Amino acid sequence: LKTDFDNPRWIKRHKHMFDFLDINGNGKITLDEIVSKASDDICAKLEATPEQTKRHQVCVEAFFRGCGMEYGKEIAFPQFLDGWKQLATSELKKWARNEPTLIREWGDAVFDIFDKDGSGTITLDEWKAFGKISGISPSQEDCEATFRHCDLDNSGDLDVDEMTRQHLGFWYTLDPEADGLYGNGVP
Ligand SMILES: O=C(Cc1ccc(O)cc1)Nc1ncc(-c2ccc(O)cc2)nc1Cc1ccccc1
Ligand SMILES: [Ca+2]
Ligand SMILES: [Ca+2]
Ligand SMILES: [Ca+2]
Numbered sequence: 001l002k003t004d005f006d007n008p009r010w011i012k013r014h015k016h017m018f019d020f021l022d023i024n025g026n027g028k029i030t031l032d033e034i035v036s037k038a039s040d041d042i043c044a045k046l047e048a049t050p051e052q053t054k055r056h057q058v059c060v061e062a063f064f065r066g067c068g069m070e071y072g073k074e075i076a077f078p079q080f081l082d083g084w085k086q087l088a089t090s091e092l093k094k095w096a097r098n099e100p101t102l103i104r105e106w107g108d109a110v111f112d113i114f115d116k117d118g119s120g121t122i123t124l125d126e127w128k129a130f131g132k133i134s135g136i137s138p139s140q141e142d143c144e145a146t147f148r149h150c151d152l153d154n155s156g157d158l159d160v161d162e163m164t165r166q167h168l169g170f171w172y173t174l175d176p177e178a179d180g181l182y183g184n185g186v187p
Pocket of ligand 4 (some may be wrong): 148151152153154155156157158159162
C-alpha cells in the first residue's frame with residue numbers, strides 16, 4: 001500500500017498511456033478521448049455485451065472524473081498525473097480497509113467481461129482475453145506468467161480481488177510484482 005510517485009518509471013508509465021489515449025496527439029487529454037480509447041475500443045476488443053459495455057463506461061467515467069477529467073476539458077500531462085497521485089492516495093486508504101473503490105468497481109466490470117464460461121472465476125483459458133487489451137498480444141509463456149503473478153493463492157483461477165490487486169499495483173503503486181502485467185509494450 002505504498003506509492004512510488006517520483007519514480008521515473010511510474011511517470012513514464014502514465015505518460016505512455018496519456019500519449020496513447022490522446023487521440024488527436026495534441027498533448028492534452030479529455031474524458032472524451034479516454035472514453036473512446038479506454039472504454040469503447042476496449043469493450044469492442046473483448047466482445048462485451050451492450051450491458052457490460054455501458055457498465056464499463058460508467059466505471060471509466062467515474063474513475064477518470066476521480067483523476068480530475070471531464071468531457072470537453074483539455075488537461076495537460078502534469079495535471080493529469082497529479083490527478084492520479086491524488087486518487088491513488090485516497091483510494092489506497094479505502095483499499096486498506098476493504099472499503100469500496102473506483103478501481104475495484106472498474107475491476108468488477110472488466111472481470112464480468114473476462115468471465116465469459118460464467119463461473120465467478122477467471123481461468124487460464126479466459127485470461128487470454130487480457131492480452132487483447134494492449135497492442136501486443138502475449139506469447140503463451142507470458143500469458144501463463146502474468147496469470148501466475150495474479151494467482152496469489154495458486155488456486156488455478158483468479159477472483160476479483162486478485163485481478164484488482166494487480167491492476168492497482170500496476171497503476172497506483174508501481175508494485176514490482178505487477179511488472180510485466182501488460183507486456184513490454186506498456187512500460
Ligand atoms: O487494463 C484495463 C482493463 C482492466 C483490467 C483489470 C482491471 O482490474 C481493471 C481494468 N484497462 C485500463 N486500465 C488502465 C488504463 C490507464 C492507466 C493509466 C493511465 O494514465 C490511463 C489509463 N487504461 C486502460 C485501458 C487500456 C488501454 C490500452 C492499454 C492498456 C489499458
Ligand atoms: Ca487530445
Ligand atoms: Ca470463468
Ligand atoms: Ca486464485
